[PDB]
Design a protein around this ligand. Structure first.
Ligand SMILES: O=c1ccn([C@@H]2O[C@H](COP(=O)(O)OP(=O)(O)O)[C@@H](O)[C@H]2O)c(=O)[nH]1
Ligand SMILES: O=c1ccn([C@@H]2O[C@H](COP(=O)(O)OP(=O)(O)O)[C@@H](O)[C@H]2O)c(=O)[nH]1
Ligand SMILES: OC[C@H]1O[C@@H](O)[C@H](O)[C@@H](O)[C@H]1O
Ligand SMILES: OC[C@H]1O[C@@H](O)[C@H](O)[C@@H](O)[C@H]1O
Ligand SMILES: [Mn+2]
Ligand SMILES: [Mn+2]
Lengths: 282, 282
């Protein structure tokens, strides 16, 4: 039951003036592509607060990556779903290395101890298995957001992202034609996508959705990875290749612009990006 | 469980070329606004067929309005959800006057006999009550679409419209500022909207959604109309005023452009409309 909004005073949307004329703001399957200027966060905040929405955020910090948690969490506190209920799930082989970061009201952190794998490829790839865990998220949160830890928030990341299923435009490929995408190209892999298929190249470092849709996606990608293993093939970009195959065949209901996953050292600050919200740490 | 799409070959969406630059294609609460050029119907058709989607279409044909049914249904057959399962629900005081129109496969028509009210205002207004009926739609269709009968389809009206809750931009007001909207302005009415509120002016002749959301909307508008009656006030534009109050406070998840409800005699064929899909019959 969606509760009625209260009276609100805000600028009228005008149908004969687009917000943004410089970028695609809706996919061909009618999913919004989230850019600054496309959303009124006051409206969205109302809608999601009236539902008492809880967002879970998953992050893996294995081996030396535990060093990135302090900045990741400190800046999450400043920028990520502020005002909403948040549950951080920190998966680590080193529980005692998790920094004690002061949280705002309505926000909590759980440390989930996991095995470290030796190869950084397996650490990255096994996130899907670990995320898929399963009864816990279903009882505790409405949405799950799944990110890389070697990152910092610099600007607003809020309920505008929430939807049944989302992926994020990889910042190196948003302007590329599809044959340039680094999809897995060997037919022997479950992640295979031919040169004439593909909508976008999604980044493995930022995806999410409802708990149900996230469990579906992580289960399907883990199954597909196990099939590849049994067959002696490792996809070119590991979990990210499978994520891309999944999202090709199960279209996301929102797509995040590269505002939401950017690398300023590698790519600068183009005029098309009005905000750099979540960025790579050198 | 959303089933996997098959391989498909279609044009790549390019994030640095918008489809449409001339019109707003997404609302500030991240609802798509459906214009020609924003959707790939082949993708949407796949998505909805894999769900075996059934669409119900409600139409009232009371008193002399039964004359409009032949053209309405004949042209629906040519343009409305072709290839999908369709159930037409024709509400009439004259069952024997319903024309025998030949339907495509997978499509059916039921005639629901109702009382005629004397005043065209009450005939229009009581649609909400009649639509809200209730167990029947829940068992028989996935979505309900609710339209005026004095209309004809001229072009494609398909699954691009389907969503939990939609309204349609009134063709006389899409370019107007909000204080020009003919919302009910008396505070004594449940339909009241102040001059500094409002996103759009939605047309009472074309709305829809999931069966659940449509039942919510029609129930809320009927309750609000009964309150107004008890209080001796009739809103300026009857059901349409209440519809507008509802959609202000419960935002639609898609908005249809005026392609979907147009009057060529009154308003011509502006360049912003690439297609005139469902049009007023003189
Ligand atoms: O030794 C490792 C390697 C990977 N990761 C996790 O896997 C993510 C993906 O790896 P990485 O950020 O190195 O990949 P990149 O962004 O360079 O593609 C990291 O953010 C961590 O969250 C980890 O915790 N420890
Ligand atoms: O005597 C009447 C008056 C109204 N209607 C139904 O109510 C709708 C709304 O009325 P109308 O189309 O006259 O309103 P308008 O489009 O002129 O605002 C009509 O399409 C019919 O579906 C009807 O069936 N018989
Ligand atoms: O081509 C795909 C790759 O692009 C790189 O820029 C990124 O650092 C990698 O993790 C991978 O996503
Ligand atoms: O101002 C609202 C009105 O606009 C007219 O153009 C239309 O014929 C009416 O039914 C009503 O919608
Ligand atoms: Mn990373
Ligand atoms: Mn009409």
């Amino acid at each position: 039951f969606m509760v009625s909004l209260p009276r609100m005073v805000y600028p009228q949307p005008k149908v004969l003036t687009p917000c943004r004329k410089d970028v695609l703001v809706v996919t061909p399957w009618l999913a919004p592509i989230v850019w600054e200027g496309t959303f009124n966060i006051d409206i969205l905040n109302e809608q999601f607060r009236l539902q008492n929405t809880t967002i879970g955020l998953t992050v893996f910090a294995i081996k030396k990556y535990v060093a990135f948690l302090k900045l990741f969490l400190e800046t999450a506190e400043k920028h990520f779903m502020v005002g909403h209920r948040v549950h951080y799930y920190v998966f680590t082989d080193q529980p005692a290395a998790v920094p004690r970061v002061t949280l705002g009201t309505g926000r909590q952190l759980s440390v989930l101890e996991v095995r470290a794998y030796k190869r950084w490829q397996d650490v990255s790839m096994r996130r899907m298995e670990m995320i898929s865990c399963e009864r816990r998220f279903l009882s505790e949160v409405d949405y799950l957001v799944c990110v890389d830890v070697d990152m910092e928030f610099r600007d607003h990341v809020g309920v505008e992202i929430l939807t049944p299923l989302f992926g994020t435009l990889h910042p190196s490929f948003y302007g590329s034609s599809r044959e340039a995408f680094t999809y897995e190209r060997r037919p022997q892999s479950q992640a295979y996508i031919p040169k004439d298929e593909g909508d976008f190249y999604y980044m493995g470092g930022f995806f999410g959705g409802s708990v149900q849709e996230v469990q579906r996606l992580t289960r399907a990608c883990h199954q597909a990875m196990m099939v590849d293993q049994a067959n002696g093939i490792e996809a070119v970009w590991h979990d990210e290749s499978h994520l891309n195959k999944y999202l090709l065949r199960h279209k996301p209901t929102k797509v995040l612009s590269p505002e939401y996953l950017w690398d300023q050292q590698l790519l600068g600050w183009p005029a098309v990006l009005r905000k750099l919200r979540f960025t790579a740490v050198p």
